[PDB]
Amino acid sequence: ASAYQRFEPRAYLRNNYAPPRGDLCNPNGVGPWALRCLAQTFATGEVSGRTLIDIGSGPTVYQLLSACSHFEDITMTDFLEVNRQELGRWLQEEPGAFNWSMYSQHACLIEGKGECWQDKERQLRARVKRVLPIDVHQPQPLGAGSPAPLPADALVSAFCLEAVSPDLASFQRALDHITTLLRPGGHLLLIGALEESWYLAGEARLTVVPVSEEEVREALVRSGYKVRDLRTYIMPAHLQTGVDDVKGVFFAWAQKV
Ligand SMILES: Nc1ncnc2c1ncn2[C@@H]1O[C@H](CSCC[C@H](N)C(=O)O)[C@@H](O)[C@H]1O
Ligand SMILES: O=S(=O)(c1ccc2c(c1)CN[C@@H](CF)C2)N1CCSCC1
């Protein structure tokens, strides 16, 4: 976790959300695939509620585009204040925010409700009430009296756990830790890197725990969920760029029972 002090948000984004991994024009891309998982899961209108919490938001919002139209109270979090910062920048259309419009549009495109994308970036910005600091290794990630509405009706996390835990055991605990935040019967949308062990972010060189679809599932069950849906996307050769060594990406729709 010490390494996370050299984390460069602008380089993280550059490494992962700007072409090639960021080109949403090719259907076979990982961008389209991920946004599609989210779209379809929420489209089933089974993941509803008043509040929602996004764990380890980092400096990204794509993970919330389809969600934002289902929960009025959205809470975004992250360790690094540097990330909580970059988030704010886009939340207040401040100077030099990252441009997510291409992602916004591909959410609207995929959702097919004919929504204009400026309208989606509006609904999101509006529904995100707070950007809180968080530590998944803590038995109570947020803190004691967090401004966050608990328990949340739903959880969303992307590439967090496997990137902050040094091994499967650390990973499982971290999972159980955030699971506490989820109301019983609420939903979890977990995205992540399969069999990855490192990834760059400017100066920083972060360790990752290579995990598998079975390890991730077995661990989801172990944490107390009833695995609703679990998909795997194999990273094509053209999306390997030495910013990391990821093999594929996983999507999980879990339900705390
Ligand atoms: N102890 C901890 N608890 C929670 N998040 C942590 C953490 N230590 C580091 N992080 C954050 O976990 C993130 C991993 S990168 C993932 C960013 C974003 N979720 C995306 O979808 O791309 C970083 O933003 C990092 O700051
Ligand atoms: O699969 S991605 O290319 C992606 C997105 C983010 C990350 C990785 C990969 C791998 N390293 C993670 C840190 F360990 C961060 N994709 C980028 C476009 S939006 C959906 C996610």
Question: Is the C-alpha dihedral spanning 32, 9, 209, 239 positive or negative?
Answer: positive
Domain extents in the chain? 1-257
Experimental method: X-ray
Cα 225 to chain centroid distance, Å, stands at: 18
Ligand 2 centroid–CA 128 distance in Å is: 22
Output 137-142 pairs: Cβ under 8 A, ≥24 positions apart: 137/1, 137/164, 137/165, 137/170, 137/173, 137/174, 137/177, 138/177, 139/177, 139/180, 140/177, 140/180, 141/55, 141/77, 141/177, 141/178, 141/180, 141/181, 142/77, 142/181
Residue nearest ligand 1's atom 2 by CA: 135
Ligand 2 centroid–CA 144 distance in Å is: 31
Here the tokens at position 17 are 């959300």
Angstrom distance (rounded) from CA 213 to CA 190: 12
Does ligand 1 have an atom closer than 6 angstroms to the CB of 9? no
Ligand 2 centroid–CA 22 distance in Å is: 9
Angstrom distance (rounded) from CA 169 to CA 184: 23
Nearest atom in ligand 2 to the alpha carbon of residue 208 is 14
Nearest atom in ligand 1 to the alpha carbon of residue 135 is 3
Could you say which DSSP state residue 200 is in?
E
What was the resolution (in A) of this experimentally determined structure? 2.8
Question: Is the C-alpha dihedral spanning 213, 215, 216, 220 positive or negative?
Answer: positive
Task: Place domain 1-257 in its CATH homologous superfamily.
Answer: Vaccinia Virus protein VP39 (3.40.50.150)
